[PDB]
């Protein structure tokens, strides 16, 4: 349907504000939102938002209640909620049965149309007991207050906005939508002690709507500048394609842009290595990349197994005119058994937790991109971001 997300992110941020302000001993788990099996006999929640007004007006607020009555009609037998802002008025009030009847009253074509669509049968008393209309402040205020809270928590201020904050809300939402058998509630103390040790930028639909996103891109871009300025280096990408969007048709563009900026000259004398995990078939990708103009080093000899030697060798290069035998390197991870003689200089990971090659000298960079077009701004290949 309409799926007004901003109300949902506000609701989750309310969870989070209470969690941060919470004292020792508190134990809660997320009330699952409908927009996720419906785990639990009856444990559900839902919310929407509207905050534009110079003073309270009972006139406009109707539509949410009508569409939510319809939703109740489609399924029931499972709590509900609502948030909205008008100047001055605040707090939570229980609507009266006479007020609910008035809500039954409609003076608009769309409202009366939804009413006609709404099932005749209703339990207005169960609605009053089960539905509510709360009023609160705008969101940005909550966000800035959360910023001060995180400051009070005593974390490195320079890094609060890039890693801690965007990853917090994500952890909180991980519980909203999931299917597994494990402890549900989340204690605060272990929560903070754990999040304090995780460094992995996180982008997604949720964080994208997060108010303060601009600084994140800029920080992560100014960080990788020196890492992507030198000419001769060794770089190692690793990817999981199960959870990314529209992989099969957008991986190629990324590969081409990369290989066409960083491995098209003479002094570029250590082409990269791309690795994919899962069950993907390299044949089709190799074929298309040939059709584009590039050549690859599968690493194989006779199509049985990979040799760790030939994959890592140096290529032949001639100046006038320019030719280069192999420009990129491909191999699946499970098949590659061994290690490199020279330990890489940069090891990027996309949607993965741990790898054997990690080390102290080797620099790691852990991301959680949901789409691939965002990283393109992080690695200086397009000026704008969608």
């Amino acid at each position: 349907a309409e799926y007004s997300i901003k109300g949902y992110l506000y609701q989750f941020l309310k969870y989070l504000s209470e969690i941060l302000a919470a004292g020792d001993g508190a134990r809660i788990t997320i009330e699952g939102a409908i927009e996720d099996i419906a785990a639990g006999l009856t444990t559900a929640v839902q919310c929407k938002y509207h905050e534009q007004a110079e003073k309270y007006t009972l006139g406009k607020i109707y539509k949410p209640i009508l569409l939510m009555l319809e939703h109740f009609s489609k399924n029931s037998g499972v709590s509900y909620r609502l948030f909205c802002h008008f100047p001055g008025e605040s707090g939570t009030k229980a609507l009266t049965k006479d007020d609910l009847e008035t809500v039954l009253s409609t003076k608009g074509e769309v409202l009366r149309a939804i009413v006609a669509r709404i099932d005749t049968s209703v339990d207005y008393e169960a609605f009053l007991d089960r539905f509510a209309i709360e009023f609160g402040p705008s969101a940005e205020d909550l966000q800035v207050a959360v910023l001060a809270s995180l400051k009070d928590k005593g974390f490195d201020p320079d890094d609060i906005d890039a890693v801690i904050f965007p990853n917090a809300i994500q952890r909180i939402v991980d519980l909203a939508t999931r299917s597994d058998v494990n402890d549900r509630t989340v204690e605060p103390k272990t929560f903070l002690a754990g999040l304090r040790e995780v460094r992995r930028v996180t982008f997604t639909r949720w964080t994208r709507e997060l108010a303060t996103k601009g600084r994140m891109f800029s920080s992560l871009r100014k960080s990788l500048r020196s890492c992507l300025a030198h000419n001769s280096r060794w770089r190692v990408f690793v990817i999981n394609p199960l959870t990314i969007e529209n992989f099969d048709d957008d991986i190629v563009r990324f590969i081409k842009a990369f290989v066409q900026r960083y491995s098209s000259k003479y002094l570029h004398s250590n082409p990269p290595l791309f690795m994919l995990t899962g069950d993907y078939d390299l044949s089709v990708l190799q074929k298309r990349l040939y059709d584009a103009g590039l050549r690859c080093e599968t690493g194989k000899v006779g199509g049985t197994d990979v040799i760790i030697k030939e994959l890592f060798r140096r290529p032949i290069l001639i100046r006038n005119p320019f030719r280069m035998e192999f420009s990129l390197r491909l191999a699946k991870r499970d098949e590659v058994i061994g290690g490199p003689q020279r330990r890489p200089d940069e090891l990027f990971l996309i949607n993965v937790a741990d790898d054997e090659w990690k080390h102290e000298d080797v620099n790691v960079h852990g991301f959680k991109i949901e789409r691939l077009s965002d990283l393109e701004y992080i690695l200086q290949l397009r000026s704008d971001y969608a």
């Binding site: 000259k265 003479y266 002094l267 100046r319 200086q380």
Partner: protein
Amino acid sequence: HVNFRFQIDTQPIGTLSEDGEFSRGSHSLPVPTEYAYVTP
């Protein structure tokens, strides 16, 4: 002549990045086999 072998001498001023920053000074000495380009 003897092929042709043109030549174009040049003097340095400063540096320009992608984002747009201009920095004055011969901060970098360019390595050979590096391409040249014309200026809009």
